[PDB]
Amino acid sequence: HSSGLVPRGSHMAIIFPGQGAQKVGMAQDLFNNNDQATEILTSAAKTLDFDILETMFTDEEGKLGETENTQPALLTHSSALLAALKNLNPDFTMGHSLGEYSSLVAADVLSFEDAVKIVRKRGQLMAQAFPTGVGSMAAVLGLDFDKVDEICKSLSSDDKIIEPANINCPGQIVVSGHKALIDELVEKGKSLGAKRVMPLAVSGPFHSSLMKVIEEDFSSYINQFEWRDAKFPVVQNVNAQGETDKEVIKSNMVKQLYSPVQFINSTEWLIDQGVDHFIEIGPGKVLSGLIKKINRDVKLTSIQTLEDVKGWN
Ligand SMILES: [Ca+2]
Numbered sequence: 001h002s003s004g005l006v007p008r009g010s011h012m013a014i015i016f017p018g019q020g021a022q023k024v025g026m027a028q029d030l031f032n033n034n035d036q037a038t039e040i041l042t043s044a045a046k047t048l049d050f051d052i053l054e055t056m057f058t059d060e061e062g063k064l065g066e067t068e069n070t071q072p073a074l075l076t077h078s079s080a081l082l083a084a085l086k087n088l089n090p091d092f093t094m095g096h097s098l099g100e101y102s103s104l105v106a107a108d109v110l111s112f113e114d115a116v117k118i119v120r121k122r123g124q125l126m127a128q129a130f131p132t133g134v135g136s137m138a139a140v141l142g143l144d145f146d147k148v149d150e151i152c153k154s155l156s157s158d159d160k161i162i163e164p165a166n167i168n169c170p171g172q173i174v175v176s177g178h179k180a181l182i183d184e185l186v187e188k189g190k191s192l193g194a195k196r197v198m199p200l201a202v203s204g205p206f207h208s209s210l211m212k213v214i215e216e217d218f219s220s221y222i223n224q225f226e227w228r229d230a231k232f233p234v235v236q237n238v239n240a241q242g243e244t245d246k247e248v249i250k251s252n253m254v255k256q257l258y259s260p261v262q263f264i265n266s267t268e269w270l271i272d273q274g275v276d277h278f279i280e281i282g283p284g285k286v287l288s289g290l291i292k293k294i295n296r297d298v299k300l301t302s303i304q305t306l307e308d309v310k311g312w313n
Contacts, residue, residue, distance in 0.1 A: 008274035013235075014088060014281055015291075016078045016095030016102030019202075021284035022070045027077040028057040029306045030084065037080035037306070044076040044116050052076060067203060071098045071123035072116050078102040078282040079112045081303055085281070086313045092242055092275060094235040094266050096287060097166070097207065098122075100256065107230035109249055114225040121221045125214040126257075127203050135205025136179040137165060138186055141172055142195025145264075148173040151192060155181045165207035166261045169293035174200065176208035211258040219254050240265035242273075263287075267294045279303060 030037035031053065044052050055064050056073045063069050078095075079102060082088070093103040101119045104110040110118065129135075140148050145167065152162045152175055162177035162185065175185065182199060189197025205211065227250045233242025238255045240262040267290075270278075277299040280288045285302040292300060303312060 009276045011091040011270075011274040012089065012277040012279060013092040013094065013270050013275045014082075014090040014103075014106055014279045015093065015287050016074075016099035016106070017280065017282040017284055017286050018074060018096040018098035019067055019070055021282055021286050022064055022073055023283050024057070024059045024064055026056050026073065026283045027080055030080050030309075031057070033306055034080075034084045034309065036083035037309075040080040040083045040112055041076060043113055044072060047113055047116055048072060048120060065201065066127065068120065068123035068127045071101075071119040074098050074282060075101050075105070075112075075116055075119050079105050079115075081281050081309060082106055083112075084306070084309045084313075085303065088279070088312075090232055090279075092233045092235055092270055092273070094237075094270065096263060097237065097256070097261050099282070099287075100234065100237055100253070102282070103234045104230075104249070104253075107232055107234050107244075109228050109230050109234065109246065110225065118222055118225060122218060122257075125217055126206060126211070129211060129214050130204045132203070133179055135177065135208070135210055136182040137174050137176040137200045137202045137206060138182050138189075139172060139174045139196075139198045139200060140185070140189065140194050141198070143171065143173070143193060145173055147193070148175065151185065152177075155184055161209065163208045164260050167264050168261075169264060169290040171195070171293070172290070174207075176205045177210065178205065207256075207258070207260055209258050214257060215254055218257060222250065222253065235266040235270055237261040237263070237266065240269050242269070263290060264294055267291055271295055271298060277301065 095103040105115045160178040162181040165176035166174035186199045227246045229246045230244040236252045238252045238259045279301045281303045288300040
């Protein structure tokens with residue numbers, strides 16, 4: 001201001017949701033109503049080997065929530081919104097699990113066509129990593145991280161493991177690992193003091209050390225594309241810090257598979273750099289809800305529809 005002392009603040013981060021934020025009908029309002037968004041949607045349609053747009057808009061096969069489909073659907077919706085927005089001037093970005101790929105497209109690490117192929121393979125490898133019934137995930141609500149981690153250490157036994165996977169906000173920690181231990185937690189969660197332990201609709205033990213089984217296949221595929229440096233820092237899920245290096249970001253995308261999503265620490269790191277406005281771009285406002293529980297003073301904007309794009313523009 002007029003004192004010549006500009007407070008740390010006024011930085012803005014654009015952020016992107018992942019699995020769990022999809023909805024049938026997503027992006028149907030953009031298609032053929034905005035040229036930039038439609039370029040992205042038609043790119044995804046021409047690139048993918050299934051009918052991504054039918055799957056997003058009407059999902060007559062009820063497969064939108066199967067992660068091999070949901071991942072490219074979410075990337076496509078967030079990127080289509082992003083392409084339609086004018087003078088979005090982010091200082092940083094982050095995204096939740098799949099959402100980090102939307103950050104990579106936003107920061108020009110990856111082109112949209114390279115990223116949509118990459119996340120389709122990421123979804124197919126995750127979906128096929130373990131047979132039905134071997135690994136799963138559950139949301140533990142109402143407990144501090146230290147208590148959830150203790151519980152996980154107690155139940156991990158007999159060569160089976162359960163680990164904190166998605167560290168979302170105070171009172172919401174998703175855990176992941178062998179299904180027998182996930183189901184024991186589901187059964188005993190109330191007695192252990194959790195407000196609610198919700199088993200989740202997932203095909204495997206995502207973001208647990210068990211996902212090392214797909215590291216090699218994923219590293220091999222991602223070498224088929226050119227990765228670039230980021231134009232502004234991507235706060236990565238593995239380490240909760242801003243990264244711009246192409247080789248550091250690429251290596252962290254492979255580690256991301258089998259490492260917990262550090263959403264609380266990434267949110268905190270961004271606020272400690274002076275981010276006071278987060279703009280969520282995608283279907284739903286799930287990350288805005290998590291950030292509100294992390295810090296109630298920062299500003300939250302959600303961009304979900306063509307009308308929200310018009311209002312911003
Ligand atoms: Ca990854």
